């Protein structure tokens, strides 16, 4: 549950760290982040947004349960 911009940046940083580890150096000579390109609008898939364009602040099954439980009726008094 993160902002997609933020996950794109963090996910680039992870790639840079993995590159540094592969090259066996303290720095990665080839970086996927902090480049000259202003990729501010870049988006990446995240678990924050459902398939309907809504927010996943509450799980979909929970929404279905609450919606369906507002109509149930019980036996008469």
């Amino acid at each position: 549950l993160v902002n997609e911009h933020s996950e794109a940046k963090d996910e680039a940083d992870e790639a840079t760290k993995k590159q540094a580890k592969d090259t066996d150096k303290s720095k990665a000579q080839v970086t996927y982040s902090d480049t000259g390109i202003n990729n501010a609008n870049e988006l990446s898939r995240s678990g924050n947004v459902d398939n309907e364009g809504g927010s996943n602040q509450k799980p979909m099954s929970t929404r279905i349960a609450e919606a369906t439980s507002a109509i149930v009726s019980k036996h008469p008094a």
Binding site: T16, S26, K27, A28, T31, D34
Partner: protein, 1264 residues
């Protein structure tokens, strides 16, 4: 207190500003001081009615301490060692009972010394006896670290404070320093002494004598008592003198008590030395409200250290503390030693200050003053086995596949190397190349100066040299019967006068003796005193390091005197929005070995010298031939220069290591030889080399490694914005980084934090431990700055402590006066409350002004009149019916201060003198019709003035010595000095020319021929004095005192002919509400007023006085000031330029520049400061921290205000009087209490010409 006032009524009333001072009252008080006894002082202590607030619990644990047996053991090498229970550092003296090792002293049954019988079994070889005697001797040494018995200081404090509160002449009110009834340290001192003494009628827990210490036989005595008493008396003095807050003093006392109640007092103090800084200075202004911050500018070139003051900038919350919080660390430290409370109140009090003013800096200074100030003492064996046993950790080493074939001992480093060593090699390469190309290197005089530099009257481990030479069957002259020490480097040079270098080649690989120094709040430091050939062969290293420090980096050369450092650097660095980084190298000497550094620097120096130096000898070292193997396959021979020969030998020595010789005087049977690789501390190349490597490594980090090891763009931008020529200042292992505040405020703290982590990581892979501090404060050379205000550290100037490392007895009586005056001046620089400090200094001067002597039934008393101290620079309080507290300790010393205060109070002095019947008929230009010639004699003022100039050390000169042996010694020294025939011919030419022309004008022409005589005298004076020399002292002082005089020196009589005229005050130099030096505030009026009227010295003194001389450096033994004075005397007395040429030729300058400089000096005009030295006029040491130059230039007007007068005319060719009279005006203006005042010349009695004739007469007659 009744007996105190009974004995010192008149004296206290005189030194408290109630009655006029007089010699007779002073001597009566001195006699009373000499007539007390220890128990009498304690009974006096019993009468102070201490208040409740000075009460605090004392743990019972201090008195009851275990035996010393479990703290020591014997190693496999049959050496006594300290058993460690708290960690690797628990090697200090434990806290153990002692009384069961004491033999009662005859006639002093209550006291005793270490048992002599135990000493007998110790020297036999017993184990327990050895342990016991080691413990006893080390405890005695720990208790001997004071200047004088504490009872003297305590009694002097009692006498001073019996006078009550002081009246402020400027504030027109009374100070509110609480009396002794609220002095917690004195109450603790009295209670602990009484509890130790108990029923026994003697009160002193121990007795400090020159021969050592005697312990009181009590079952509650502990080895930890003496240091505790020293700390308590220091704190008690400081609270009453500087007006410390009693609440903080109580915390300091609590820390001292906790230290006593621990297993080892010294170890505890060492481990807890940083509570006050970490809780007050490093955590200050967390929430900021307002205040002022000075606006300083760093001009160009920054190499010049040129700063100019602009003004004040209001502060704001924008500049609150932003360094990482240290709360967790402080709490952990306080918890680990059971002082969490003290930390709690320290933090709580610190949070209370939100504005930057005088109050906050005063609080910080008071908090810092409460740290203990003992000299940590531990046995030499543990120091050696703890300090030389660690080695660098080269985490990333230079690959072995990156070296060439050997050239003798060196090995050339390839240029394809991936290591960072390449830049270090390049830097040293260029440094050596630029050094060797200087023509002055080949000048014989320069080489002679370098040779003489390390020829001093200090030790050089000559014995090891002797058996090293005997190892190859070479016998040195013995100089039998010489009344000089053989254990001096002068003696070594004399014995090494006429030997070939090939014969002395093996001497470099000799051993090294021992040497220790104790410090305050720091572990004792060890020294390796290299011998003469080692110093000789270490030259190129020193020269290259000097070149680097002089040219390629920012590096100072100032000493540890507070005056000579760069205050502007610190004040600029601490001021926001600038930020400072404090960088230190832990165990710097132990971190430089052959593995990484030496193998590169030696190769670089050897290679970067061959071109500019091929086929030339040097320093006596000749050229030689070495094997060549750099290129593959081809192995050839190669000539090398003298420097390269020295490099080869020094490389051999560095590769092998070092051979330290130890002789533990506190431990019988503890002596051996220790092989170590630690870089020597006693050599001449230590500090310069350390500074050079510091700068080089910092630049390498900022340029190559650092940019390649971090990826955060902010860190990259920051690092690319930093360079060493702009931002880094280094000296030895201490360095400072300045982060210039940006246009948007100040640099983000997170970026600084990550950069610091980068430096910390970068230091490890070549084995350097970077101790880095970033807390919003600036520290350099143990000077502390916060927000542009410097905080003096009182604790590092112990009042009573004195460093004693050896077992030798202490000094004869008159020597202690120098230490007392030094204490007074240390208090002056540290900024204590001036009135209380002056009163207390007078008390001490009284307490030490008398001495019993035995002259063979001629039992006499040596007594110094009060005037001798005044001549020594201690200001008066009230005399001759004048107003009290009208003088300031910015008074100069010697004749200048005397003239100043006479000039200030001449009329009152005359009226007082007449009113007392001292009336005569011969009208005097200075005193009218006053009979001063007898009043001064009976007031002992003449006597005090004259005896204040006698040498108060024994003059070992004149001892009987055979003519043959003495002349052999002198000729050997001269032969050693005069190697190159060119220099000898120069000196002969100078002597002949001087006899032709300059003979008869002055009687003491400095010359290179006098160096052997001065060396012999210095070596002779280094020996231990005997009893008849002390008798010579005593009879000389008695002769001086009993005599009668008629005038002062000619110079002072000349000075009194000049009178001035005070006028309207100056203009303020800085804003009145800007804190600059902590404690210098409105409650400290006179220093505050002087500082704001004159202004701080905003330019470093070393560079300022570098231009006040003609010759920068001379041969060790001669004084540059002496040569300058001789030259200016010759010019003034009308001698022609050939005389000056001759004089320059004696000191060895070559003929052509000798003539050039002689002519230039004759026709040149010189500065006031440089010109005033002809009459031994020097700037007072206390003025160094003030802007005296501008006040010389534009506030001492030599023209009368009303217009030209008849007598104030200077003859045209006597312009140097313009230089002298400026000093007189300066002394008059500075001596007076209050603000600086514009001063105008008024009149000279005899006219300018007569004054000039008198001065020239003195100039000619001196030196006879």
């Amino acid at each position: 207190s009744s007996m105190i006032l009974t004995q010192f009524g008149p004296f206290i009333e005189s030194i408290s500003g109630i009655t006029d001072q007089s010699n007779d009252v002073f001597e009566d008080a001195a006699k009373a001081f000499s007539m007390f006894t220890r128990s009498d002082v304690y009974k006096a202590l019993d009468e102070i009615p201490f208040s409740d607030d000075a009460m605090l619990p004392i743990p019972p644990t201090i008195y009851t301490k275990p035996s010393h047996d479990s703290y020591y053991y014997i190693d496999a090498l049959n050496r006594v060692r300290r058993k460690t229970y708290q960690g690797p550092d628990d090697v200090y003296v434990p806290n153990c009972s002692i009384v069961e090792l004491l033999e009662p002293h005859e006639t002093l049954t209550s006291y005793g010394r270490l048992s002599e019988a135990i000493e007998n079994r110790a020297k036999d070889g017993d184990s327990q006896a050895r342990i016991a005697t080691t413990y006893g001797r080390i405890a005695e040494s720990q208790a001997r670290q004071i200047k004088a018995p504490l009872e003297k200081f305590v009694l002097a404090l009692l006498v001073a404070e019996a006078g009550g509160s002081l009246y402020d002449p400027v504030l027109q009110k009374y100070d509110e320093i609480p009396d002794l009834s609220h002095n917690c340290p004195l109450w603790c001192f009295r209670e602990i002494c009484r509890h130790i003494s108990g029923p026994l009628p003697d009160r002193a827990p121990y007795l400090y004598l020159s021969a050592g210490v005697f312990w009181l036989m009590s079952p509650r005595m502990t080895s930890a008592i003496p240091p505790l008493l020293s700390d308590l008396v220091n704190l008690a003095i400081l609270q009453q003198t500087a007006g410390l807050d009693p609440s903080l003093v109580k915390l300091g006392v609590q820390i001292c008590l906790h230290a006593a109640a621990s297993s080892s007092y010294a170890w505890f103090i060492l481990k807890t030395k940083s509570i006050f800084p970490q809780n007050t200075l490093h955590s200050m202004y967390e929430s900021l409200e307002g205040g002022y911050c000075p606006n300083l500018e760093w001009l160009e070139p920054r190499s010049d250290y040129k700063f100019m003051y602009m003004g004040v900038m209001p502060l704001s919350a924008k500049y609150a503390r932003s360094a990482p919080s240290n709360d967790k660390k402080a709490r952990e430290l306080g918890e680990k030693y059971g002082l969490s409370s003290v930390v709690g109140e320290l933090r709580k009090r610190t949070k209370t200050y939100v504005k930057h003013d005088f109050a906050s800096v005063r609080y910080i200074r008071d908090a810092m003053a409460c740290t203990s100030g003992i000299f940590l003492v531990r046995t030499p064996t543990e120091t050696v086995l703890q300090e030389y046993t660690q080695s660098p950790e080269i985490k990333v080493p230079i690959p072995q596949k990156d070296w060439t074939g050997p050239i003798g001992e060196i090995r050339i480093l390839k240029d394809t190397t991936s290591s960072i060593a390449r830049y270090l090699y390049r830097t040293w390469y260029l440094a050596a190349a630029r050094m060797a190309a200087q023509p002055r290197t080949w000048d014989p005089l320069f080489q002679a100066i370098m040779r003489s530099q390390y020829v001093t009257a200090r030790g050089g481990s000559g014995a090891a040299l002797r058996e090293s030479l005997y190892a190859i069957n070479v016998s040195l002259p013995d100089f039998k019967g010489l009344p000089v020490k053989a254990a001096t480097k002068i003696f070594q040079a004399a014995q090494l006068a006429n030997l070939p270098f090939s014969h002395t080649s093996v001497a470099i690989l000799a051993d090294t003796s021992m040497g220790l120094r104790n410090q305050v709040q720091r572990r004792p430091r060890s020294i390796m005193p290299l011998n003469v050939p080692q110093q000789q062969v270490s030259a190129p290293h020193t020269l290259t390091a000097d070149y680097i420090n002089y040219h390629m980096n920012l590096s100072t050369t100032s000493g540890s005197a507070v005056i000579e450092k760069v205050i502007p650097l610190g004040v600029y660095a601490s001021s926001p929005p600038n930020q400072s980084i404090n960088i230190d190298i832990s165990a710097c000497d132990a971190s430089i070995t052959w593995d990484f550094f030496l193998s590169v620097i030696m190769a670089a120096i050897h290679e970067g010298v061959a071109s500019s130096s091929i086929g030339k000898p040097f320093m006596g070292v000749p050229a030689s031939i070495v094997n060549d193997e750099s290129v593959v396959g081809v192995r050839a021979a190669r000539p090398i220069s003298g420097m390269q020969n020295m490099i080869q030998h020094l490389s051999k020595l560095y590769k092998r290591g070092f051979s330290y010789r130890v002789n533990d005087s506190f431990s019988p049977g503890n002596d051996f030889t220790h092989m170590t690789t630690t870089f020597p501390s006693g050599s001449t190349a230590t500090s310069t080399e350390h500074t050079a490597n510091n700068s080089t490594m910092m630049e390498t980090f900022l340029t190559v490694w650092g940019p390649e090891h971090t990826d955060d763009p902010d860190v990259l931008r920051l690092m690319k914005s930093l360079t060493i020529q702009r931002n880094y200042v280094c000296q030895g292992d201490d360095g400072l980084m300045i982060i210039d505040g940006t246009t948007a405020g100040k640099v983000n703290s997170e970026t600084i934090q990550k950069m610091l982590e980068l430096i910390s990581k970068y230091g490890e892979e070549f084995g350097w431990k970077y101790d880095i501090a970033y807390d919003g404060t600036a520290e350099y050379l143990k000077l502390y700055f916060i927000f542009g205000c410097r905080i003096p550290n009182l604790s590092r100037h112990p009042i009573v402590g004195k460093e004693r490392a050896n077992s030798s007895a202490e000094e004869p009586w008159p020597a202690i006066l120098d230490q007392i005056m030094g204490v007074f001046f240390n208090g002056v620089h540290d900024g204590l409350q001036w009135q209380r400090w002056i009163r207390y200094s007078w008390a001490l001067c009284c307490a030490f002004s008398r001495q019993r002597t035995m002259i063979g039934e001629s039992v006499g008393y040596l007594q110094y009149p009060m005037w001798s101290f005044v001549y020594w620079g201690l200001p008066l309080v009230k005399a001759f019916g004048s107003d009290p507290w009208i003088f300031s300790w910015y008074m100069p010393t010697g004749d200048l201060g005397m003239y100043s205060w006479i000039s200030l109070i001449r009329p009152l002095m005359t009226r007082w003198m007449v009113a007392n019947g001292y009336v005569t008929d011969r009208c005097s230009p200075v005193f009218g019709n006053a009979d001063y010639r007898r009043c001064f004699n009976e007031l002992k003022l003449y006597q005090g003035y004259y005896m204040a100039q006698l040498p108060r050390n024994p003059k070992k000169s004149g001892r009987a010595a055979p003519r043959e042996v003495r002349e052999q010694f002198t000729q050997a020294l001269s032969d050693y000095l005069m190697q190159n025939p060119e220099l000898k011919s120069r000196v002969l030419r100078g002597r002949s020319e001087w006899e032709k022309y300059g003979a008869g004008i002055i009687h003491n022409p400095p010359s290179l021929f006098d160096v052997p005589h001065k060396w012999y005298q210095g070596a002779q004076e280094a020996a231990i004095a005997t009893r008849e020399e002390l008798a010579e002292m005593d009879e000389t002082l008695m002769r001086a005192r009993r005599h009668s005089y008629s005038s002062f020196s000619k110079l002072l009589e000349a000075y009194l002919l000049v009178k001035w005229r005070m006028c309207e005050a100056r203009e303020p130099s800085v804003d009145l509400r800007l804190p600059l030096c902590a404690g210098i505030d409105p409650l400290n009026s006179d220093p505050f007023l002087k500082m704001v009227s004159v202004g701080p010295m905003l330019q470093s003194t070393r560079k300022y006085f570098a231009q006040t001389l003609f010759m920068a450096k001379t041969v060790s033994g001669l004084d540059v000031n002496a040569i300058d004075s001789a030259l200016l005397r010759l010019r003034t007395l009308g001698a022609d330029k050939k005389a000056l040429t001759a004089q320059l030729l004696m000191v060895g300058l070559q003929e052509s520049e000798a003539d050039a400089l002689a002519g230039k000096i004759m026709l040149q005009d010189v500065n006031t400061v440089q010109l005033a030295r002809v009459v031994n006029l020097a700037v007072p040491d206390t003025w160094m921290s003030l802007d005296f130059d501008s006040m010389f230039k534009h506030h001492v007007k030599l023209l009368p205000k009303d217009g030209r007068h008849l007598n104030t005319d200077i003859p045209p060719r006597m312009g140097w009087l313009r230089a002298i009279l400026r000093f007189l005006g300066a002394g008059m203006v500075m001596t007076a209490t209050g603000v600086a005042v514009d001063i105008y010349l008024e009149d000279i009695h005899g006219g300018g010409r007569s004054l000039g004739q008198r001065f020239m007469t003195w100039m000619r007659q001196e030196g006879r």
